[PDB]
A paper describes a structure:
Sterile alpha motif and HD domain-containing protein 1 ([name]) is an important regulator of cellular 2′-deoxynucleoside-5′-triphosphate ([name]) in mammalian cells. Although the HD-domain contains the active site, [name] hydrolysis requires assembly of [name] into homo-tetramers. Here, sequences at the N and C termini of the HD-domain stabilise inter-monomer protein–protein interactions and incorporate four pairs of allosteric nucleotide-binding sites, AL1 and AL2, which regulate the enzyme through combined binding of G-based (AL1) and 2′-deoxynucleoside (AL2) triphosphates.
Therefore, Mg2+ ions were substituted with Mn2+ ions in the [name]–dNMPNPP co-crystallisation conditions and the structure of [name]-[name](109-626)-Mn-[name]-[name] complex was determined at 2.25 Å. 2Fo − Fc maps contoured at high σ were then used to locate and confirm the position of the highly X-ray scattering Mn2+ ions in the active and allosteric sites in the structure. Co-crystal structures were determined using either wild-type (wt) wt-[name](109-626) or a [name]-[name](109-626) AL1 allosteric site mutant that generally produced higher resolution diffraction than wt co-crystals.
Numbering used by the authors:
A (entry chain A), B (entry chain B), C (entry chain A), D (entry chain B): 114 to 276, 284 to 599
């Protein structure tokens, strides 16, 4: 029978006993010890919430969406097997996040190990494998009608994508099932629905998307010889607003300039510790923070705990890492200098990121200042903000239906909706920080930065006239 | 001493005894009998809230904002007198709404009496006058340090605007006070703050704007020889999102196509009753629903009650009005045919509105029709959606300040914020309805409508290929 | 197919087309015009909510509870027919409330017509009959598998109770179905669940009962040869807290001394109008406010609108009624003198209520005062507060089950739960008010009242020493 | 100037720069790593909140309450100095909590070091001292008008109580200030207000106490030659409900039987690790988990992290500790056998707690047993549930005031409020668990347990007839 758990977002939810078995494992329970927002807790003190609760939510929403489709449309032949696979993928979709979540795959692994291209989602597929293999889960699957050769593959495909029609877990008459946990067509998935609601509750910013409404109006229809989830035509405004909410959440919380600096400092600490910490994996082999991702027995033990392991240590070889964490505790963070954006449809390419602190340091502002600054002293953090498909409008990849022909899919273009929608769907934000924290250096960094913005024809920083009054005169265009 | 009232949105609020005296009058209490959202209750069953509670909220917020400015900046010389006048203006700002709120000044008065320019806000100024004059309020003002020659004028000016520097109630060193209740500079006022939160709570759509945050970061600064309310620079995103919220509330709730059709039907009922209902005003004179606005003693008794007076009557001369309200009760509404918008910087002028049903009826669809339809059978509802200043971006009329120069006001342009903001700030939506409700007539109305949209080079209705498959191929612009 | 409606409490809910048909009738829609809390809106300005939305909620919760039982226990043979009947009874359970809800059957009908014993629930059964008969609903029932001889009876029985085993609508193997809408065994029904949540949302007092949790743990078991709803043993604390919440809601809101006085004043107004208002019922026959309950065509048109009909009238015969409503608008209410309770396990019997204002007026307080007072000047409002079964503990009438024997019903006594629970389950509150509102009379009424409390050996009013300092010395027991 | 922080419970709060300096210390920041509800997160997945955020809330509420008193009563002479000290005490009141909060002072320290009387509050006083002394805070206090000889003492006294009139930090004309952070008179303090709201928000149980209402109605009056905080007379019901809420929160959440068993298992782990984990304190001295409380430099590094340190270790001497934490991860918890209470004014004394597992193991059930169980196999957890003052009614220690004599304090007794209030204000709950988890041993533990309850004349467990049908007939008192 069912086990019931109380979640403040979703209320009392039922967990099928196979889900309980997956949950009550070291590999699942690890997620109690990884904060959803990483460094964002150090800005938003409500945001103590871990990946654990998020994962329970995704699993429950994934089952709500799949059940609702099955009730309304028996003709789809959604089996109890399908329902369970969707639920497990939801539950397990984030098992590969590392310490401070997106800090780990967004900043640490890319700087510490350029020789791999890794993502938490790959992590999740590997960790799922290890969880199943090391806890006897395969006979428990079989016991509920699942067929592991086929279903393990199905689950992994839902989490990460593929490993004509590119999937080995289900056929085209069940493609809709791939659109629930992680929707590669348009991004509209239950994962966003849970984190929207959960992050807002903890952050103290209020959610304006209604996922329940969306589920009541969803429906599977034929689109290009494949059965897909479509929304009612009238929900198009709400789907625009869903993506607008996502961007607003990034702007107010997830990319808060100080949350990002803290994530950068923790990443720096971890870089300075990577040579000297040892995590014991399979066969007693020793891994590093950056290689624990290659062995799931070691990765199991790599959580936000590592922050405190570094902070509390006495080993002299961790002094450098330790002193950075101490600077976070005392709130001697690197200083935010400002934000700018490129113009003229120009994009800053990933190759160039490492060059930008030099360019800032080589600016020649007319005003003379008490201290000169080297490239070492500047951080330039480039952030790619979008509607989750680079430059594309994701509502172009949604199918809709009308009350009068419920089985007939249609498209709806931007022009059919509103002229007050965004004109573009991707941009870049450049933040600049200084590691020298005294007033004299900060005043200098402000001059270098504003000169650099003038030199590159970037947008006038918002406080430009105030922080660099001698410099915003240079550009006639900034009257 | 203070009287405390419990409001579900704002919690326990303190009401100065002068405010109590204004509240406990028939002219104030009338607002318990006018629904905030008018016809919206007939679509959103939680929207039973009236103007009364909204008015208490505006009053309270207006005092919170004025106190917060006073606490932080004693140099502004905000007196207890000023605070109270701001509170009274907030409290009394909506005393001129009529039955079903915006239905009355947006639809009924314009059709019934085209020869007047009238708004609820002018109503409020006149009703405030009648309230003061008929309840002995002027001596109670004097009792608390107010000066009615000056302060009555101040209050009225805050509600309606003016009646060099155009105000007779306060000087330029107190201009900021005009920006609280009704902000003619940029629309950022406590009226929106209350209704956002109150409407959301009742509608069952969740608010994402945080008014308290904005008040913590507000500040008065000198801008162009006038003292004005300015926001912190970092709030600029939140202000863009405030206007986006307002627009989303209009699209989801306030302009819901069925909410609007109900308001239209009620307006029609009222038009057919206007000759035959008699409301007793000053000196026993008899007024009509359309002229009760010229006598505040009569207007006092004109509330949503009139709907029920019509619906419950037996007078044979109200049969026509009555039968329309019966059609609302049985849910035999006029039928929604669809929505379209103009293109290419075409704008539909107010003069033209009355012509549009004819143009729809004169569409000549190629496909034969079994029965014709006349202009009488069509409703065409034009809605001007904007960011509250016609085609202007209201954030261009906001002043900001920076952490490093808190007394120095600055401007922030669109391009300094984001490329994902709206490209325009006004549009028009055209909705078309049919009063003949059977399948045969609805099919026909769909053909006329879609043909008309093709004829005017308007946008393709979302369901066009479904409702008029013979017509959407004609038009090259839609493929 | 289903129609979806958005309710701020229950979110998006589905309405079966038979429910839509019942809803879209004059008899149902009338409930938009009757406030749930009656006079409580005049104290709690959020409490603008009508019976309409409450009724939709009860109907939806009734279906949630019946579906959940059917999913979990197929062996019960809960049919789609049963589900619909339960839903209709929920929907229609409050169709008999009159103006200001419980004011009408609690105060007005008892004073205006002692020759009937009437309740809103009888009203609901009669109004249900009229709605069905006058809107062609019987063939629409048949069309969905319902059998009206049997099912109409079932519905009515759920609302009002019966008209061995006392029911003609369903047998003992379906008794559980009578426990959903109005639970005569123990009061634990979906009606309380909706109003708890809905009243709290509008009042601005927060709900602490979780109905969803309760539904997840409910289960039908055999009890005394009848199938009944039982709760899990662990929910016993939550059922005590449910009734505690109900009592707290009565104390803070529903029996707020000023809400009750307003209800009393409106009742008085209606008493003074009952001879002079005419409501047209079936066959053109004229009914009164007090007799409209005998004809459902007339009752259909009797709503809170009557308040405004009286307030706005000019007929000289309604002057007396009108002037009372005017005193509410200006907030010249009768004055609250205080509260007391009986002691010594004594109960005040209903016979005696009319005698109590005399007894107060005949008190002989030692202090001499400027004005003497007659019985006419006092209101004594006796309120019977309980756990909804007079003196009984309703948790004694609940059956529970244990995780180890889910099909075996058990009892749980107070002593098995806690010693911090109430010792008794019913009491009486006596409120005394004065209709003379000047300071001199109020001071007098305070002396009479406190003397009366001393004379009857009632509890010392809370402010006794302050309002009647000369009198609380009389009783040594009040040191 | 002020720093603003966004808290999901209290919204945007202002922190004086002195508060910022206290906050940004390792001794304050440590609280980010101690869960408010300890083992409760392992039952309620929303309860990931730490002491840090609670501390910010207490600090903020403490200032709201002190400011509100100051605004309304200037005559009290509340200085900015006083306000800040109250804020600091609120902020710092919980700095002495250890790992898993109340698990540490409620269970671990009492078992590990029986020879000390220690509480988190004494911890807080010592940790506050270490924070001040090791971060140069005394000069920053002087900089803002505080006087450390006096004010440090004041702060400590607010947290812990005293160290005629027993306080050295403020005189009798400021006694009210001791009633804000930790109220030794009656327990009505801002600490409860914050945790009620914060725990509810995270637990997913809804709060029904309104702290803001209480603050609007609070007032200082003279009572017995001491100035104290008094409430309006009409709040007496709400104060009874406040304590009832606290008890309901304990019954539903804080004392959930599985929450308590997890805390017990963690405590057991810690007991088995105490000899082998070494924490570096002042002058390089090594401390244990149990002695880190004697050195604030060591205690600084003792947080929930220790759980993970044990679970991730390889030291063979932590195997025993480690295997217990493994049993938590796999959800092989000790098994709950049942709950009982004493009767007849029997009380279980703290001396006796350790004896109770033996008494259970020595029960001689008549029914044969296939296997015996030893004392070692049983846990008996005694919980003292009360209204925060052992057997006293805390409303007997509240002072009230009336509208007509706002400076005159009065008392209100139970019988003047209601007959539905608790008869007692303290009880004990006895929970019994078994460490042998198989069916055979659980069956046996159920017999021992129910026999023991029969032997001690304790209450019949709720499931008694089900778990021990051979035993509950024996006892005449249970039929
Ligand atoms: N009174 C209450 N109100 C709300 N949530 C509650 C609650 N009591 C517990 N929770 C939350 C905490 C959990 O997240 C969830 C389940 O707790 P249990 O219903 O106590 N289930 P368990 O497995 O202990 O008992 P058994 O095995 O006898 O069925 O409900
Ligand atoms: N326990 C409660 N909890 C929440 N709101 C409450 C409440 N009791 C009343 N309200 C709401 C109802 C109102 O919206 C507001 C004031 O009600 P009173 O404090 O009852 N004030 P009144 O003027 O009757 O008493 P006096 O004049 O003797 O002081 O709070
Ligand atoms: N964007 C929105 N967000 C939330 N609630 C909304 C909403 N739009 C409407 N509601 C609420 C208002 C109602 O209480 C409910 C249904 O409104 P519709 O989904 O607009 N249904 P209708 O019958 O107009 O269109 P059709 O016949 O084409 O299906 O949802
Ligand atoms: N748009 C937003 N909405 C809600 N909360 C927000 C928010 N942005 C931030 N927060 C939260 C995060 C924090 O809990 C709090 C303060 O964040 P800042 O206003 O960003 N203050 P900071 O110190 O970075 O800027 P400076 O020092 O230049 O003034 O509000
Ligand atoms: Fe996720
Ligand atoms: Fe307004
Ligand atoms: Fe009801
Ligand atoms: Fe605390
Ligand atoms: Mn993910
Ligand atoms: Mn994604
Ligand atoms: Mn207005
Ligand atoms: Mn406006
Ligand atoms: Mn009822
Ligand atoms: Mn009932
Ligand atoms: Mn504490
Ligand atoms: Mn305490």
């Amino acid at each position: 029978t069912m086990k019931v758990i109380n979640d403040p977002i979703h209320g009392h939810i039922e967990l099928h006993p196979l889900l309980v078995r997956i949950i009550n494992t070291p590999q699942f329970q690890r997620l109690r010890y990884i904060k959803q927002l990483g460094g964002g807790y150090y800005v938003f003190p409500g945001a103590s919430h871990n990946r654990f609760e998020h994962s329970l939510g995704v699993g429950y929403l994934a089952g709500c969406l799949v059940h609702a489709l099955g009730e309304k449309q028996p003709e789809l032949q959604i089996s109890e097997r399908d329902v369970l696979c969707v639920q497990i993928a939801g539950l397990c979709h984030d098992l590969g996040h590392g310490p401070f979540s997106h800090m780990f795959d967004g900043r640490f692994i890319p700087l510490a190990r350029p020789e791999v291209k890794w993502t938490h989602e790959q992590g999740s597929v590997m960790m799922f494998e290890h969880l199943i293999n090391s806890n006897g889960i395969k006979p428990v699957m079989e016991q509920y009608g699942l067929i592991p050769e086929e279903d393990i593959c199905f689950i992994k495909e839902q989490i990460v994508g593929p490993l004509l029609w590119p999937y080995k877990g289900r056929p085209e008459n069940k493609s809709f099932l791939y659109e629930i946990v992680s929707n590669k067509r348009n991004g509209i998935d239950v994962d966003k629905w849970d984190y929207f609601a959960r992050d807002c509750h903890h952050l103290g910013i209020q959610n304006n998307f209604d996922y329940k409404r969306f589920i009541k109006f969803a429906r599977v229809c034929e689109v290009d010889n494949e059965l897909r989830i479509c929304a009612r035509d009238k929900e198009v405004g709400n789907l625009y607003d869903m993506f607008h909410t996502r961007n607003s959440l990034h702007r107010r919380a997830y990319q808060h300039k100080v949350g990002n600096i803290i994530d950068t400092m923790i990443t720096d600490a971890f870089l300075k510790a990577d040579d000297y910490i040892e995590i014991t994996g399979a066969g007693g082999k020793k891994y590093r923070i950056s290689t624990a991702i290659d062995d799931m027995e070691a990765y199991t033990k790599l959580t936000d705990n590592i922050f405190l392991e570094i902070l509390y240590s006495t080993d002299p070889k961790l002094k450098d890492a330790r002193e950075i964490l101490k600077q976070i505790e005392y709130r001697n963070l690197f200083k935010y200098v400002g934000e700018t954006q490129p113009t003229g449809q120009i994009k800053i390419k990933r190759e160039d990121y490492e060059s930008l602190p030099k360019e800032v340091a080589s600016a020649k502002p007319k005003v003379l200042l008490d201290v000169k600054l080297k490239a070492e002293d500047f951080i330039v953090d480039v952030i790619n903000m979008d509607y989750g498909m680079q430059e594309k409008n994701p509502i172009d990849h949604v199918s809709f239906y009308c009350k009068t022909a419920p089985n007939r899919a249609i498209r709806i273009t931007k022009n059919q909706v509103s002229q007050l929608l965004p004109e573009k769907f991707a941009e870049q934000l450049i933040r600049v920080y200084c590691k020298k924290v005294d007033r004299k250096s900060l005043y200098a960094a402000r001059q270098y930065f504003v000169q650099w913005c003038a030199d590159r024809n970037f947008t006038k920083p918002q406080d430009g006239d105030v922080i660099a009054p001698l410099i915003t005169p240079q550009k006639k265009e900034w009257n």
